[PDB]
Amino acid sequence: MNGTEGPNFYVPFSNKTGVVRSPFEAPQYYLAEPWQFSMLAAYMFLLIMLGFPINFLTLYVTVQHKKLRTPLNYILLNLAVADLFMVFGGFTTTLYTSLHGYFVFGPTGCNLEGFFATLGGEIALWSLVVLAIERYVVVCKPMSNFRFGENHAIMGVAFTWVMALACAAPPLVGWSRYIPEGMQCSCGIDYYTPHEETNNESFVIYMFVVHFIIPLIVIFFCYGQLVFTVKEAAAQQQESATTQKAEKEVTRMVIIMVIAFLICWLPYAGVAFYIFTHQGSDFGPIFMTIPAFFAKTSAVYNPVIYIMMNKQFRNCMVTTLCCGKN
């Protein structure tokens, strides 16, 4: 017996010594040193200091620059907003709770925190899916005479919200649950304790297939064709050095975007799938946070890849940050 069950939680620590407390009531300093909690707080603090400016400046320059307000950029703003949800929903809260040693906001706060953090990360997730689709449609042109505009673009943004709620809301109403996670300071989906009262086994697979596999495939197809469409058009146009550069620059970005997507969500997949295969073994608190470490940082490196390596967002940002010059 490697854990300690409760009504609305699961502390990954044996209570054979009588020391385990509810993560809503007393600090869990027995499953992690108090400095490990400070380091958690340190890390949360970092993601606020980087995540908030970068994602907020993305929203700010779009207000200052008419040329950023194009339909093919809507999904990118949605992304920055999704990260802001990840910041003020998950990072700020976890910073506060880490400094007490337990999730002081009770199970109610556990559902709020878990909802908005899950909502933020999934809006961002499907935002990447939608963006990949749009680029496939725009570049590869599968539909003759089709034109991508403001109407289609708003559909794309709403689609992420439906997909995200399709993942973040069922745990509020009984198809999974938000419980304290890892060092018990942040709340997430219970993917690792069979809870037939909420049918976690089904939800994990729903998550794994719908939310993970489907995006992984869409993003691989959409970007697969795109490099192909660009490779071919370059070969037929080898007399154009620019068209040869674009092919190389685009191939590079496609690799970065794909790889980044894997780093963000592959860990989570690998761990959850392991727990599903190797059910309910001794998984430590810090073990649980390693998946959690990678997608949370996406709130910083997604805006870097998608906004800051976008040539215009960058120039508008530089001009904005340099008082209107350059």
Binding site: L72, E134, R135, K141, T229, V250, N310, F313
Partner: peptide, 11 residues
């Protein structure tokens, strides 16, 4: 493709 590549921000 170039004009379509700039509209999506990939080049």
């Amino acid at each position: 493709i170039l004009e379509n590549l700039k509209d999506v921000g990939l080049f």
